[PDB]
Design a protein around this ligand. Structure first.
Ligand code: ZN
Ligand code: ZN
Ligand code: ZN
Lengths: 45, 92, 119, 65
């Protein structure tokens, strides 16, 4: 078999508005989840 | 109606495309000297046909008159200058 | 080479010499199993290779549109139906000989005018 | 964006011609070429002036205030 070509355009992908926002959002949401858990600990009700 | 299909660059590897439909689909059994030197339809095995070859180009390249009569990078250059050209950009 | 495995535990068979009767034995190191060697050949190198040229000649080879068709008539069925590839061996050194597969008898024949091949 | 008054090249007053040019094509169902020469546009400098103009003014008017 021939060595794989790293520059075959078919073995590449494009990340448009949606997936770039998906990455960003996930991180931010998880950062609010960690704050929701933090407020819960501080709530000694 | 399955007359047209979506081919990715990976799927492209397993298909055979004719450039022109009419110019690459009949058979044979005088010619204009002015026209460019073209290839045959020796392929029996044609799976797909190119809608129009000029669709290989992007927005910029598509404003170039006769880009097929130019030196390769001269087109590349104009595909930068047309963006730096003035004109109406929106009616508002 | 074509080596065997130890029955009972399907593990690799290693050679052992029976110095008494001066014969080769294939011993198992995953148990007590032994067996006489068929061949006297234990290992083979092969620097110059001739295997990998007729690679992937499945029945559906004639269905591949990406493959070219020719007029070359068949040596056995005599059909002018072909599909040919270059020597499938992916070495730099390789020659550009054609391997024609018939769309009827499904047998392979080359364009080579030097060697009396049978593979 | 509104018909140029005078052809850039030779300065023949192309200004008045517009409305009459549009009317030759629409009404008199004439081809662009014949319509052009009917308005008297003989040289191609004047001819491009009318033939190649894009009346964007009509789009801009569509905006209310
Ligand atoms: Zn064993
Ligand atoms: Zn045959
Ligand atoms: Zn003029």
């Amino acid at each position: 078999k021939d060595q794989d070509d790293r520059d075959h355009f078919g073995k590449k992908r494009l990340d448009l508005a949606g997936p770039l926002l998906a990455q960003l959002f996930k991180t931010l949401f998880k950062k609010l989840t960690k704050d929701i858990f933090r407020y819960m600990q501080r709530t000694v009700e | 109606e399955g007359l047209v299909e979506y081919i990715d660059a990976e799927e492209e590897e397993s298909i055979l495309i004719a450039m022109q439909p009419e110019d690459l689909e009949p058979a044979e059994a005088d010619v204009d000297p002015a026209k460019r030197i073209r290839v045959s339809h020796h392929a029996t095995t044609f799976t797909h046909c190119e809608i129009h070859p000029s669709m290989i180009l992007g927005v910029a390249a598509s404003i170039i008159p006769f880009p097929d009569h130019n030196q390769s990078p001269r087109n590349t250059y104009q595909s930068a200058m047309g963006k730096q050209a003035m004109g109406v950009f929106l009616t508002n | 080479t074509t080596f065997r495995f130890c029955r009972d535990c399907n593990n690799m068979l290693y050679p052992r010499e029976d110095k008494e009767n001066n014969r080769l034995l294939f011993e198992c190191r995953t148990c007590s199993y032994v067996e006489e060697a068929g061949s006297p050949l234990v290992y083979r190198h092969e620097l110059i290779t001739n295997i990998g040229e007729t690679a992937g000649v499945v029945q559906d080879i004639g269905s591949d549109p990406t493959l070219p068709r020719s007029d070359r008539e068949c040596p056995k069925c005599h059909s002018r139906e072909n599909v040919f590839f270059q020597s499938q061996q992916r070495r730099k050194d390789t020659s550009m000989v054609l391997f024609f597969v018939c769309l009827s008898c499904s047998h392979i024949f080359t364009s080579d005018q030097k060697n009396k091949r049978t593979q | 964006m509104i018909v140029p008054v005078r052809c850039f090249s030779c300065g023949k007053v192309v200004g008045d011609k517009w409305e009459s040019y549009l009317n030759l094509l629409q009404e008199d169902e004439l081809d662009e070429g014949t319509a052009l020469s009917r308005l008297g546009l003989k040289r191609y400098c004047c001819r491009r002036m009318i033939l190649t103009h894009v009346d964007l003014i009509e789009k801009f008017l569509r905006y209310n205030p």
